[PDB]
RNA sequence: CUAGAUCUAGCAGUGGCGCCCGAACAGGGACUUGA
């Protein structure tokens, strides 16, 4: 029938030879899939002489009718050579709007391809009595590749002779359909039905054709629009972290189509916790985070299928938090999909650097889904970002793009200045600490001789550096021109960060903010420079040695 | 024919990096080259046989508006160095470098004229993408030696040699150079003389039938560029501190250097915003300094056999630098040029400069992200050969280069 | 081959949420030696 392709086994191995213990209630299971896989002409019977050994490990799935077949190649698929892997899944989003839309499933398809002779003596199948399987097993590594191979190499002609038609194939799923009538449509499936038969496949004339809405993978694919499998919540007021799993899934599963939907305040109560029991209670944020999420819920919505011909819009909306969002949508109001980025690429971290993630990772999905970039309509100004961009030390590029006047809004709280300005001081800080004691100790200096200083408590150098420059900022003025002795408090004002995890930069941000300016700069220590060396000195007490 | 047989590193593995994304508008004339690429008798659809994959994606590139494709075999020259190393190996020549201008050619396309072993061809797996998952990738396997590769024009050099014998017999001043797909040539001469002996090895070279259908070059005016430092009078603290910083951390980059002078002044604690005016011993060092750093370097060297670093950073306004160096703190040259487009264009004449230079490529470290530059940079692509890469995070010494 | 109180059970391939280890780069701190 088809092309087998030849398999070999990786450099210096053989088959493997394992002695488990069955039932008895399952023999006459095993004997009756066995008989019926042998007499239909797939499985033969070779066990005299092959010295290898392939377990079974029965088991009752859904649907409970009987303990049905596995097969175990736990210890083949290592000794197996690594093969090619391509199918690593579509989207409905990223479908073309179709009239005349069906599906053709197939029964025991995987069974519908033999196997290189050279390769079955690896198959063992006792239990007695052995049945080499000549066709593709379950549970073998290149299963599904070869699979794949073949029904592309099969169907190849066919869409050689039909390419006005789509053909979204998958595991054993062939979505197909055109913009036809249903007559010709249903000749062409016919014919279809047909060149398949020609290699020995399965079809019927009654199965899930005018049955859909379709389920697949759990999504509804109806003619002119789609949406997930119905989802639903619970309704109770405990929360165990098996529950909260189930439920973050499910709603960043379902997050695609519904807008608006917050899981940063609901995903932050697994941080520590790791037991498979242990309850936690629901802060009144992430309360009512679920029930926001829940009200949205209240109400249906379906997607719909992109044109080729026509493009594709972007948008987002900001709600603080970097709890981002952004729709796809080709006429207002017509939100093809949606999904959610609040990732923390590190905690320092500011507004517009989140944004431009996130239009990355959405030119990237949009990319892998339909093949494009679309254009983006995001709330900032052009002045704003090419000031930004400008001033940065990368290159932060985006496409074509506009400005949307939708609150809230992107801004940047403060500025830095690269030039002291006269009527400000300077304050020569410096902050470190003992690798036992920690106990730091920090101040501040004036030229009027304002000093003050004030001991840390279990902080690192950073962090002390960090709470000096605090404290030299609580008791200043407006502006004011600051020197450091690392890069870490260069590095981390520099870039301008809005929002972080550590509540010490936060309140640093938080004080600064109402500053009407401030002025930075940066020198090294080791060499005596100015007041640097003197505040070293003064802070020596008992910190170094 | 006699394809000579070639394997990887000894005991190695074949390259199986997967494939970024593409679009749809690239990918159309992808599959629709291919086509005609299959049918000439160059590549054949093959199965999962063999797990081995390579990256590819097509560009655009200047003088014409076709979409040309190319591989990206970074991996597979990583693990077979050795083979075009030791095996077929040819020299570098430094005095092409010298000449007044050069033109760098394309024949990439007398390659396919050479069937290849086929024990190797299991290594020259390359896969094109599917949007939307559609369906798996068409495989196909180079039957014939392929482009963007160093191993080819290795083997090819035998019968290159006479192909260009004729020409350079009777041009002995003219110089060449083969590094990859990409051809260059060493002119001394008149510009105009340089095009008409373009044009006569361009047609010496379509004598045998073997059809081979930036633009120029001048690497004369490129020199190291001398680090700058402000020259003014009045230098408040911080202006004082700025250059003391400056000097500090070139310290560790020039052995001779000294802020001795330069730090007497700075005893003395005071605002940010007051000017102080410097007295001779400061002078002298200011002259000193100027003097030493004007001057290039002194005890530095090139490796053949070791690696290759060229960092890269951003200033503003298209403001862009770059060094080269094997190891920390030795620098072999720097320069300037006057935003993917631009980075695009940069590390573009840098890898020239490598080439006729040194004639390797180096190891950039791009101050970007991953997901944007691997997804925006093919678009802005007009060579054939691409080098490593990798991303680092700048810190705030760097940019003192230079404004 | 492993888990539970000699008996019973325990299977793999894909997409997500949440944790641990190794490799490379950056910043910081100590032990030996010499000037």
């Avoid at chain 1, 077949?69 to 899944?89: A, G, H, P, S, Y």
């Avoid at chain 1, 939907?261 to 790791?274: A, H, P």
Wanted: some cysteine.
């Amino acid at each position: 029938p088809i092309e087998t392709v030849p398999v070999k086994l990786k450099p210096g191995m053989d088959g493997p030879k394992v002695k488990w213990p069955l039932t008895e209630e399952k023999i006459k299971a095993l004997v009756e899939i066995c008989t019926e896989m042998e007499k239909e002409g797939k499985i033969s019977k070779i066990g005299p002489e092959n010295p290898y050994n392939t377990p079974v490990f029965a088991i009752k799935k859904k649907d409970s009718t009987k303990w049905r077949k596995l097969v175990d190649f736990r210890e083949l698929n290592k000794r197996t050579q690594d093969f090619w892997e391509v199918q690593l899944i579509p989207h409905p989003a990223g479908l073309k709007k179709k009239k005349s839309v069906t599906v053709l499933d197939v029964g025991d398809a995987y069974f519908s391809v033999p196997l290189d002779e050279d390769f079955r003596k690896y198959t063992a199948f006792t239990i007695g009595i052995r049945y080499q399987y000549n066709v593709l097993p379950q549970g073998w590594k290149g299963s599904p590749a070869i699979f794949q191979s073949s029904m592309t190499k099969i169907l190849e002609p066919f869409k050689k002779q039909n390419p006005d038609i789509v053909i979204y194939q998958y595991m054993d799923d062939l979505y197909v359909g055109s913009d036809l009538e249903i007559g010709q449509h249903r000749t062409k499936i016919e014919e279809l039905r047909q060149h398949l038969l020609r290699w020995g496949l399965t079809t019927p004339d009654k199965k899930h054709q005018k049955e859909p809405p379709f389920l697949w993978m759990g999504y509804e694919l109806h003619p002119d629009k789609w949406t997930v499998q119905p989802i639903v919540l619970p309704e109770k007021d405990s929360w165990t972290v098996n529950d909260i799993c189930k439920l973050v899934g499910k709603l960043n599963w379902a997050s695609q189509i519904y807008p608006g939907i917050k899981v940063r305040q609901l995903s932050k109560l697994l941080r520590g916790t790791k037991a498979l029991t242990e309850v936690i209670p629901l802060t009144e944020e992430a309360e009512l985070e679920l029930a926001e999420n829940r009200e949205i819920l209240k109400e249906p919505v379906h997607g719909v299928y992109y044109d080729p011909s026509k493009d594709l819009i972007a948008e987002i909306q900001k709600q603080g938090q970097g709890q981002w969002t952004y729709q796809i949508y080709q006429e207002p109001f017509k939100n093809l999909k949606t999904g959610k980025y609040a990732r923390m690429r590190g905690a320092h971290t500011n507004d517009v650097k989140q944004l431009t993630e996130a239009v990355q990772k959405i030119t990237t999905e949009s990319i892998v889904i339909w093949g494009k970039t679309p254009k983006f309509k995001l709330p900032i100004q052009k002045e704003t970002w090419e000031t930004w961009w400008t001033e940065y030390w990368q290159a932060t590029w985006i496409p074509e793009w506009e400005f949307v006047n939708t609150p809230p809004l992107v801004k940047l709280w403060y500025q830095l200045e690269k030039e002291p300005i006269v009527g400000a001081e300077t304050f020569y800080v410096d902050g470190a600490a003992n690798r036992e004691t920690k106990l730091g100790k920090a101040g501040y200096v004036t030229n009027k001789g304002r000093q003050k200083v004030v001991p840390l408590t279990n902080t690192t150098n950073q962090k002390t550096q960090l709470q000096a420059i605090y404290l030299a900022l609580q008791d200043s003025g407006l502006e004011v021109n600051i020197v450091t002795d690392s890069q870490y408090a260069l590095g981390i004002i520099q870039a301008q960060p809005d929002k972080s995890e550590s509540e010490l930069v936060n309140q640093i941000i938080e004080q600064l903010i109402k500053k009407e300016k401030v002025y930075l700069a940066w020198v090294p220590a080791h060499k005596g420079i100015g007041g640097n060396e003197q505040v070293d000195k003064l802070v020596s007490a008992g910190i170094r040695k | 024919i006699e394809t000579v047989p070639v394997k990887l590193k000894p005991g190695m593995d074949g390259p199986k990096v997967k494939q970024w994304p593409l679009t749809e508008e690239k990918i159309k004339a992808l599959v629709e080259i291919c086509t005609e690429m299959e049918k000439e008798g160059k590549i054949s659809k093959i199965g999962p046989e063999n797990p081995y994959n390579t990256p590819v994606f097509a560009i655009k590139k200047k003088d014409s508006t076709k979409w040309r494709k190319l591989v990206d075999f970074r991996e597979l020259n990583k693990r077979t160095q050795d083979f075009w190393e030791v095996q077929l190996g040819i020299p570098h020549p430094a005095g092409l470098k010298k000449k007044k201008s050069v033109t760098v050619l394309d024949v990439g396309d007398a390659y396919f004229s050479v069937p290849l072993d086929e024990d190797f061809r299991k290594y020259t797996a390359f896969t094109i993408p599917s949007i939307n998952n559609e369906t798996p990738g068409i495989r196909y396997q180079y039957n014939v030696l392929p482009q963007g590769w160093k191993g080819s024009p290795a083997i090819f050099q035998s019968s290159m040699t006479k192909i260009l014998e004729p020409f350079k017999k009777q041009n002995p001043d003219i110089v060449i150079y083969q590094y990859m797909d990409d051809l260059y040539v060493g002119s001394d001469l008149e510009i105009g003389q340089h095009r008409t002996k373009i044009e006569e090895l361009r047609q010496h070279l379509l004598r045998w039938g073997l059809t081979t259908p930036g633009y120029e070059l001048h690497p004369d005016k490129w020199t190291v560029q001398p680090i700058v430092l402000p020259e003014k009078d009045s230098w408040t603290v911080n202006d004082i501190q700025k250059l003391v910083g400056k000097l500090n951390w070139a310290s560790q980059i020039y052995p001779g250097i000294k802020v001795r002078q330069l730090s007497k002044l700075l005893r003395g604690t005071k605002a940010l915003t007051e000017v102080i005016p410097l007295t001779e011993e400061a002078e002298l060092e200011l002259a000193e300094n100027r003097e030493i750093l004007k001057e290039p370097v002194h005890g530095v060297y090139y490796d053949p056999s070791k690696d290759l670093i060229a960092e890269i950073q951003k200033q503003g306004q298209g403001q862009w630098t770059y060094q080269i160096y094997q190891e920390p703190f030795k620098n072999l040259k720097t320069g300037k040029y006057a935003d993917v487009k631009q980075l695009t264009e940069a590390v573009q004449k840098i890898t020239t400069e490598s080439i006729v230079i040194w004639g390797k490529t180096p190891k950039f470290k791009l101050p970007i992200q991953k997901e944007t530059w691997e997804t925006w940079w093919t678009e802005y692509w007009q060579a054939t050969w691409i080098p490593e890469w990798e991303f680092v995070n700048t810190p705030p010494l760097v940019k003192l280069w230079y404004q």
